[PDB]
Enzyme design. Structure first.
Site, PDB file in Angstrom:
ATOM      1  N   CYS A  74       0.873  -1.172   0.000  1.00  0.00           N
ATOM      2  CA  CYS A  74       0.000   0.000   0.000  1.00  0.00           C
ATOM      3  C   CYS A  74       0.904   1.214   0.000  1.00  0.00           C
ATOM      4  O   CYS A  74       1.601   1.481   0.986  1.00  0.00           O
ATOM      5  CB  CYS A  74      -0.867   0.025   1.257  1.00  0.00           C
ATOM      6  SG  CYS A  74      -2.024  -1.345   1.343  1.00  0.00           S
ATOM      7  N   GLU A 136      -7.404   8.629   0.563  1.00  0.00           N
ATOM      8  CA  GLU A 136      -6.877   8.230  -0.751  1.00  0.00           C
ATOM      9  C   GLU A 136      -7.962   7.819  -1.719  1.00  0.00           C
ATOM     10  O   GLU A 136      -9.009   7.325  -1.310  1.00  0.00           O
ATOM     11  CB  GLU A 136      -5.929   7.025  -0.599  1.00  0.00           C
ATOM     12  CG  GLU A 136      -4.714   7.289   0.273  1.00  0.00           C
ATOM     13  CD  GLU A 136      -3.817   6.071   0.442  1.00  0.00           C
ATOM     14  OE1 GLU A 136      -4.297   4.908   0.350  1.00  0.00           O
ATOM     15  OE2 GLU A 136      -2.610   6.291   0.653  1.00  0.00           O
TER      16      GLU A 136
HETATM   17 MN   LIG Z   1      -4.235   2.951   0.771  1.00  0.00          MN
HETATM   18 MN   LIG Z   2      -1.603   7.764   1.740  1.00  0.00          MN
END
Ligand SMILES: [Mn+2]
Ligand SMILES: [Mn+2]
Ligand SMILES: [Cl-]
Ligand SMILES: [Cl-]
Ligand SMILES: [Cl-]
Ligand SMILES: [Cl-]
Ligand SMILES: [Cl-]
Ligand SMILES: [Cl-]
Ligand SMILES: [Cl-]
Ligand SMILES: [Cl-]
Ligand SMILES: [Cl-]
Ligand SMILES: [Cl-]
Ligand SMILES: [Mn+2]
Ligand SMILES: [Mn+2]
Ligand SMILES: [Mn+2]
Ligand SMILES: [Mn+2]
Ligand SMILES: [Mn+2]
Ligand SMILES: [Mn+2]
Ligand code: NA
Ligand code: NA
Length: 215
Positions: A74, A136
């Protein structure tokens, strides 16, 4: 230890249009997130060739979610011409290859951008502590392949390949507080992950490059 120049994230509107750039630090401050600051990100789900999902555990040194288990990688595309590229999501695919190497030690040649598959986008918010959080639009990227792992312990404390059942058991341990999982991983596991995993040979039905899902 700290770099001379701060890493930059790509600022976006709610439709994933680039609207600027901000430091990684500023993009992850709750105070800014609450003002609406939103950035582009990606999330790699890598399966080995027996369909085990590769989980990472973030190092205890990470600023956000230290020590937490999550899916393979991530992270964020950088605000440069290479990773700003939106054609066929090449920017985020390049970013993914870059971070698979940096975090997990996977050689570039093992995961070229062409083998990183863009499924869909998910808009989410999370909080890590009193100071830090996430906000995000996250490109979901899927990979199935055997890779050679040699993580940087500064980034990654451990990893684990899990079958579906093993993941279910791991989520039980998180629920009881025996281990920690990121809010992202908790919600993705509860919403879409098992649908994708049950359909690895028939993922075209889940490809959506128009709709941005919210969770
Ligand atoms: Mn993320
Ligand atoms: Mn971020
Ligand atoms: Cl940060
Ligand atoms: Cl702001
Ligand atoms: Cl399976
Ligand atoms: Cl390499
Ligand atoms: Cl392909
Ligand atoms: Cl390990
Ligand atoms: Cl939990
Ligand atoms: Cl998260
Ligand atoms: Cl299969
Ligand atoms: Cl399909
Ligand atoms: Mn800390
Ligand atoms: Mn990674
Ligand atoms: Mn282009
Ligand atoms: Mn949330
Ligand atoms: Mn939002
Ligand atoms: Mn956590
Ligand atoms: Na390791
Ligand atoms: Na299938």
């Amino acid at each position: 230890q700290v770099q001379l120049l701060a890493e930059m994230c790509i600022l976006i509107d709610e439709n994933d249009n680039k609207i600027g750039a901000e430091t990684k630090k500023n993009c992850h401050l709750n105070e800014n997130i609450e003002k609406g600051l939103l950035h582009r990100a990606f999330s790699v789900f890598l399966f080995n060739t027996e369909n085990k999902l590769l989980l990472q555990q973030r190092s205890d040194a990470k600023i956000t979610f230290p020590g937490c288990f999550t899916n393979t990688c991530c992270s964020h595309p950088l605000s440069n011409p290479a990773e700003l590229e939106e054609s066929d999501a090449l920017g985020v695919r390049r970013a993914a290859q870059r971070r698979l190497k940096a975090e997990l030690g996977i050689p570039l040649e093992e995961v070229p951008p062409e083998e990183i598959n863009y499924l869909t986008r998910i808009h989410y918010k999370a909080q890590s502590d009193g100071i830090w959080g996430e906000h995000e639009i996250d490109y979901i990227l899927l990979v199935r392949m055997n890779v050679t792992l040699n993580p940087d312990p500064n980034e990654i404390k451990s990893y684990c390949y899990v079958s579906k059942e093993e993941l279910k058991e791991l989520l039980k341990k998180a629920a009881s507080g025996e281990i920690k999982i990121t809010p992202w991983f908790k919600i993705i596991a509860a919403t879409f992950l098992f649908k994708w995993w049950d359909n690895l040979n028939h993922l075209n039905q889940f490809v959506d490059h128009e709709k941005i899902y919210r969770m």
